[PDB]
Tab-separated table of C-alpha atoms and ligand atoms in Angstrom:
chain	number	residue	atom	x	y	z
Z	4	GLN	CA	124.226	99.923	106.628
Z	5	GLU	CA	121.277	102.328	105.919
Z	6	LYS	CA	120.843	103.503	102.318
Z	7	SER	CA	121.292	107.201	101.439
Z	8	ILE	CA	119.143	107.919	98.359
Z	9	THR	CA	118.513	111.265	96.637
Z	10	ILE	CA	114.912	112.082	95.628
Z	11	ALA	CA	114.225	114.658	92.875
Z	12	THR	CA	111.069	116.794	92.638
Z	13	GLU	CA	109.962	119.815	90.570
Z	14	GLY	CA	109.146	122.170	93.458
Z	15	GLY	CA	106.452	124.065	91.500
Z	16	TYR	CA	103.116	122.192	91.757
Z	17	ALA	CA	101.322	123.078	95.045
Z	18	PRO	CA	100.014	121.317	97.176
Z	19	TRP	CA	101.962	118.242	95.836
Z	20	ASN	CA	105.477	119.764	95.868
Z	21	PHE	CA	106.320	123.504	96.274
Z	22	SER	CA	109.286	125.842	97.027
Z	23	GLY	CA	110.366	127.443	100.316
Z	24	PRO	CA	112.299	130.523	101.559
Z	25	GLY	CA	115.954	129.609	100.827
Z	26	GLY	CA	115.341	125.986	99.850
Z	27	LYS	CA	112.642	124.314	102.026
Z	28	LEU	CA	110.563	121.848	99.975
Z	29	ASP	CA	106.981	121.165	101.173
Z	30	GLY	CA	103.769	119.440	100.153
Z	31	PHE	CA	102.099	116.040	99.945
Z	32	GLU	CA	104.977	114.319	98.132
Z	33	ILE	CA	107.584	115.674	100.582
Z	34	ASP	CA	105.693	114.438	103.669
Z	35	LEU	CA	105.037	111.170	101.746
Z	36	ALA	CA	108.748	110.755	100.749
Z	37	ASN	CA	109.812	111.406	104.450
Z	38	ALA	CA	107.234	108.769	105.525
Z	39	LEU	CA	108.274	106.154	102.843
Z	40	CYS	CA	111.955	106.626	103.705
Z	41	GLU	CA	111.229	106.065	107.337
Z	42	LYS	CA	109.312	102.850	106.367
Z	43	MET	CA	112.334	101.842	104.206
Z	44	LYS	CA	114.838	102.710	107.055
Z	45	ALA	CA	116.664	104.967	104.536
Z	46	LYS	CA	118.343	108.425	104.776
Z	47	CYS	CA	116.843	110.672	102.048
Z	48	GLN	CA	117.752	114.075	100.572
Z	49	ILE	CA	114.998	115.844	98.609
Z	50	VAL	CA	116.230	118.146	95.819
Z	51	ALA	CA	114.167	120.515	93.616
Z	52	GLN	CA	115.100	120.632	89.950
Z	53	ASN	CA	113.922	121.973	86.570
Z	54	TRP	CA	112.147	119.003	84.904
Z	55	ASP	CA	114.363	119.395	81.687
Z	56	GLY	CA	117.189	117.189	83.038
Z	57	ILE	CA	115.617	115.298	85.964
Z	58	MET	CA	115.644	112.264	84.050
Z	59	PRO	CA	119.229	112.154	82.511
Z	60	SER	CA	120.267	113.048	86.132
Z	61	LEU	CA	118.387	109.915	87.392
Z	62	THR	CA	119.867	107.609	84.672
Z	63	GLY	CA	123.280	109.241	85.405
Z	64	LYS	CA	122.977	108.168	89.133
Z	65	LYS	CA	122.925	111.841	90.446
Z	66	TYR	CA	119.335	111.048	91.621
Z	67	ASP	CA	117.968	107.657	92.691
Z	68	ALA	CA	114.169	108.389	92.684
Z	69	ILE	CA	111.647	110.931	91.259
Z	70	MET	CA	108.527	112.121	93.157
Z	71	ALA	CA	106.945	114.896	91.063
Z	72	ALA	CA	103.255	113.893	90.385
Z	73	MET	CA	104.717	111.655	87.569
Z	74	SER	CA	102.040	109.617	85.722
Z	75	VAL	CA	102.799	105.986	84.803
Z	76	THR	CA	102.630	105.746	80.967
Z	77	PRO	CA	103.626	103.044	78.422
Z	78	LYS	CA	106.399	105.356	77.063
Z	79	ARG	CA	107.995	106.111	80.438
Z	80	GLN	CA	107.956	102.349	81.294
Z	81	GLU	CA	110.216	101.630	78.259
Z	82	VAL	CA	112.983	104.017	79.564
Z	83	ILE	CA	112.480	104.027	83.410
Z	84	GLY	CA	111.272	101.816	86.227
Z	85	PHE	CA	108.220	102.680	88.332
Z	86	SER	CA	107.154	101.841	91.844
Z	87	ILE	CA	103.522	100.736	92.507
Z	88	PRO	CA	101.179	103.810	92.538
Z	89	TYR	CA	100.998	106.049	95.621
Z	90	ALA	CA	98.202	108.305	94.256
Z	91	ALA	CA	95.320	107.726	91.810
Z	92	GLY	CA	93.742	110.376	89.579
Z	93	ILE	CA	90.468	111.815	90.908
Z	94	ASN	CA	88.062	114.123	89.067
Z	95	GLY	CA	85.056	116.028	90.371
Z	96	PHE	CA	82.615	118.868	89.587
Z	97	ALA	CA	82.566	122.351	91.155
Z	98	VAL	CA	79.631	124.793	90.870
Z	99	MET	CA	78.610	128.042	92.671
Z	100	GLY	CA	76.751	127.284	95.949
Z	101	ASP	CA	74.000	129.922	95.335
Z	102	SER	CA	73.081	128.068	92.057
Z	103	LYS	CA	70.298	125.409	91.734
Z	104	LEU	CA	73.043	123.012	90.458
Z	105	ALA	CA	74.725	122.979	93.956
Z	106	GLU	CA	72.554	120.024	95.022
Z	107	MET	CA	73.551	116.858	93.146
Z	108	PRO	CA	73.018	114.504	96.192
Z	109	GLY	CA	75.856	112.323	94.781
Z	110	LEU	CA	77.948	113.904	97.595
Z	111	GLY	CA	80.286	112.684	98.890
Z	112	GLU	CA	80.343	109.429	96.859
Z	113	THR	CA	83.598	108.118	95.272
Z	114	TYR	CA	83.447	105.658	92.312
Z	115	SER	CA	86.294	103.688	90.641
Z	116	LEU	CA	85.933	103.436	86.830
Z	117	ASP	CA	87.748	100.078	87.000
Z	118	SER	CA	86.199	98.272	90.029
Z	119	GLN	CA	82.788	100.099	90.401
Z	120	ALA	CA	82.013	101.012	86.694
Z	121	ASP	CA	78.310	99.975	87.255
Z	122	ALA	CA	77.889	102.571	90.040
Z	123	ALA	CA	79.982	105.046	87.972
Z	124	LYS	CA	77.863	104.669	84.736
Z	125	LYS	CA	74.588	105.068	86.783
Z	126	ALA	CA	76.014	108.213	88.514
Z	127	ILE	CA	77.244	109.888	85.236
Z	128	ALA	CA	73.668	109.306	83.815
Z	129	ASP	CA	72.100	111.098	86.918
Z	130	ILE	CA	74.599	113.982	86.312
Z	131	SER	CA	74.194	114.195	82.437
Z	132	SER	CA	70.431	114.925	82.885
Z	133	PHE	CA	70.967	117.325	85.890
Z	134	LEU	CA	73.655	119.188	83.851
Z	135	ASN	CA	71.429	118.805	80.681
Z	136	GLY	CA	71.921	121.941	78.512
Z	137	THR	CA	74.541	123.576	80.822
Z	138	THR	CA	77.933	125.034	79.734
Z	139	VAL	CA	80.676	122.980	81.478
Z	140	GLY	CA	84.299	124.197	81.587
Z	141	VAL	CA	87.515	122.081	81.525
Z	142	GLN	CA	91.295	122.532	80.959
Z	143	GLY	CA	92.122	121.362	77.416
Z	144	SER	CA	94.447	118.352	76.834
Z	145	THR	CA	93.721	116.481	80.166
Z	146	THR	CA	92.039	113.249	81.476
Z	147	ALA	CA	89.063	115.452	82.585
Z	148	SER	CA	88.874	116.861	78.983
Z	149	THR	CA	88.792	113.267	77.589
Z	150	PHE	CA	86.285	112.087	80.269
Z	151	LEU	CA	83.927	115.020	79.469
Z	152	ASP	CA	84.176	114.235	75.723
Z	153	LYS	CA	83.461	110.466	76.147
Z	154	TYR	CA	80.551	110.723	78.656
Z	155	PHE	CA	79.197	114.281	78.686
Z	156	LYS	CA	79.329	115.292	74.945
Z	157	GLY	CA	75.844	116.069	73.563
Z	158	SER	CA	74.334	116.561	77.079
Z	159	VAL	CA	76.417	119.719	77.869
Z	160	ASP	CA	78.276	122.494	76.004
Z	161	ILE	CA	82.070	121.876	76.567
Z	162	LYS	CA	84.476	124.889	76.759
Z	163	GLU	CA	88.233	124.106	76.813
Z	164	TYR	CA	90.672	126.375	78.706
Z	165	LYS	CA	94.516	126.664	78.941
Z	166	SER	CA	94.529	126.848	82.823
Z	167	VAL	CA	92.310	125.757	85.759
Z	168	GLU	CA	92.299	129.406	87.101
Z	169	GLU	CA	90.845	130.698	83.798
Z	170	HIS	CA	87.876	128.266	83.850
Z	171	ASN	CA	87.366	128.907	87.598
Z	172	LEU	CA	87.207	132.701	86.968
Z	173	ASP	CA	84.425	132.145	84.351
Z	174	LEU	CA	82.463	129.921	86.794
Z	175	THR	CA	82.151	132.765	89.410
Z	176	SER	CA	81.056	135.193	86.559
Z	177	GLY	CA	78.219	132.905	85.395
Z	178	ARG	CA	79.830	132.321	81.923
Z	179	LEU	CA	80.124	128.635	82.928
Z	180	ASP	CA	77.626	126.745	85.150
Z	181	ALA	CA	80.058	123.893	86.192
Z	182	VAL	CA	83.750	122.991	86.000
Z	183	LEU	CA	85.240	119.471	85.980
Z	184	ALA	CA	88.841	119.147	87.120
Z	185	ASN	CA	91.371	117.060	89.127
Z	186	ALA	CA	89.863	117.023	92.679
Z	187	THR	CA	93.295	117.921	94.302
Z	188	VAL	CA	93.555	120.978	92.000
Z	189	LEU	CA	89.875	121.860	92.452
Z	190	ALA	CA	89.779	121.699	96.295
Z	191	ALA	CA	92.894	123.953	96.465
Z	192	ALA	CA	91.556	126.497	93.917
Z	193	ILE	CA	88.193	126.870	95.795
Z	194	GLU	CA	90.245	128.032	98.896
Z	195	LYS	CA	91.288	131.242	97.043
Z	196	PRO	CA	89.402	134.357	98.315
Z	197	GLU	CA	88.097	135.424	94.831
Z	198	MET	CA	86.708	131.843	94.672
Z	199	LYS	CA	84.367	132.180	97.735
Z	200	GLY	CA	80.901	130.673	97.039
Z	201	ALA	CA	82.252	127.856	94.854
Z	202	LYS	CA	81.985	124.274	96.215
Z	203	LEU	CA	82.814	120.640	95.260
Z	204	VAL	CA	79.584	118.890	94.087
Z	205	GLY	CA	78.497	115.390	92.982
Z	206	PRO	CA	80.639	112.237	93.208
Z	207	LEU	CA	84.415	111.760	92.925
Z	208	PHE	CA	85.595	109.676	89.987
Z	209	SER	CA	88.793	107.626	90.175
Z	210	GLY	CA	90.133	105.163	87.642
Z	211	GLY	CA	92.997	104.106	85.414
Z	212	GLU	CA	91.852	106.460	82.577
Z	213	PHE	CA	92.552	109.376	85.022
Z	214	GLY	CA	96.032	107.903	85.415
Z	215	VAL	CA	98.038	107.017	88.517
Z	216	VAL	CA	101.184	108.579	90.063
Z	217	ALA	CA	104.286	106.518	91.128
Z	218	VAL	CA	108.001	106.811	91.997
Z	219	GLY	CA	110.276	107.077	88.921
Z	220	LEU	CA	113.387	104.928	89.303
Z	221	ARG	CA	116.248	103.499	87.188
Z	222	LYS	CA	114.916	100.522	85.167
Z	223	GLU	CA	117.900	98.440	86.512
Z	224	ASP	CA	117.320	99.455	90.223
Z	225	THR	CA	115.062	96.451	91.029
Z	226	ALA	CA	116.037	96.473	94.767
Z	227	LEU	CA	115.054	100.168	95.201
Z	228	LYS	CA	111.684	99.357	93.467
Z	229	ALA	CA	111.266	96.411	95.934
Z	230	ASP	CA	111.958	98.846	98.869
Z	231	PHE	CA	109.522	101.536	97.586
Z	232	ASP	CA	106.862	98.892	96.753
Z	233	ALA	CA	106.973	97.451	100.307
Z	234	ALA	CA	106.794	100.929	101.923
Z	235	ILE	CA	104.005	102.163	99.528
Z	236	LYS	CA	102.014	98.962	100.320
Z	237	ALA	CA	102.464	99.482	104.126
Z	238	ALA	CA	101.637	103.274	103.791
Z	239	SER	CA	98.436	102.371	101.897
Z	240	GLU	CA	97.236	99.782	104.482
Z	241	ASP	CA	98.041	101.820	107.698
Z	242	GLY	CA	96.295	104.940	106.249
Z	243	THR	CA	99.466	107.129	106.072
Z	244	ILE	CA	98.531	108.104	102.439
Z	245	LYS	CA	94.837	108.824	103.297
Z	246	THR	CA	96.090	111.112	106.187
Z	247	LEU	CA	98.573	113.121	104.094
Z	248	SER	CA	96.147	113.164	101.127
Z	249	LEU	CA	93.315	114.682	103.278
Z	250	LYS	CA	95.801	117.074	105.025
Z	251	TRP	CA	97.056	118.674	101.755
Z	252	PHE	CA	94.215	118.022	99.292
Z	253	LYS	CA	90.927	117.635	101.307
Z	254	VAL	CA	90.412	114.435	99.096
Z	255	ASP	CA	91.765	110.823	99.451
Z	256	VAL	CA	94.152	109.797	96.553
Z	257	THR	CA	95.165	106.353	97.964
Z	258	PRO	CA	95.146	103.902	94.984
Z	259	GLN	CA	93.587	100.390	94.690
Z	260	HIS	CA	94.918	96.796	94.801
Z	261	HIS	CA	94.514	95.995	91.023
Z	262	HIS	CA	97.411	98.477	90.282
Z	263	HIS	CA	99.845	95.830	91.729
Z	264	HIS	CA	103.153	94.031	90.752
D	20	CL	CL1	104.662	120.078	107.300
D	21	CL	CL1	124.630	107.701	94.557
D	22	CL	CL1	99.231	100.656	95.806
């Protein structure tokens, strides 16, 4: 009876999905896939693969599902099917603890830009005047880069970087006073030893503009989408996602109801 589906991942984006000794895949998405497959009553094989042909391999029926921090976009929806989201994009600020900026009492608030925009707009105003005149770092060509441009332009000096590590290295130096980045990336980076003193400050921002992550499936595989959708829904309500999210990321990525069928 039981379905045997192959799940593809990148294997090079810790703590979401990362490589092992001979071939042991680990991370948030691996523990989540194992959990969803148990909810589905399916046998699953997780394979790591270069993103290049992940993709023609899925449309070619070599793979049946993709779990590689894959954002739902209008372009991807034209070519592939998507499950309901299993993670929502979250951005936050990090400063050095010994700095006067380390006390934005907006900790540890979490505001949706879609369902709590009122609380979000009031919070970004509190921040814009606290951060007034400061040099804020960000990785160029991201949702955090766009967010900082839309709401924090004029209030702060914005410096774009080509990696999170490069802006984090200039925060410890004093070159930058604050960084804004994906909260899963940020909490991981501040665990590095040359990153001691740095801490997550102010509120967490979630919303559709930060994107959402879901399972990539064949556009024709409507039954597999129905199976993933039921398991994702159950994993969201019983707190399986919150658990794994906090375990790997120290932040809760569980999405909201409005990102439904
Ligand atoms: Cl584990
Ligand atoms: Cl098959
Ligand atoms: Cl959901």
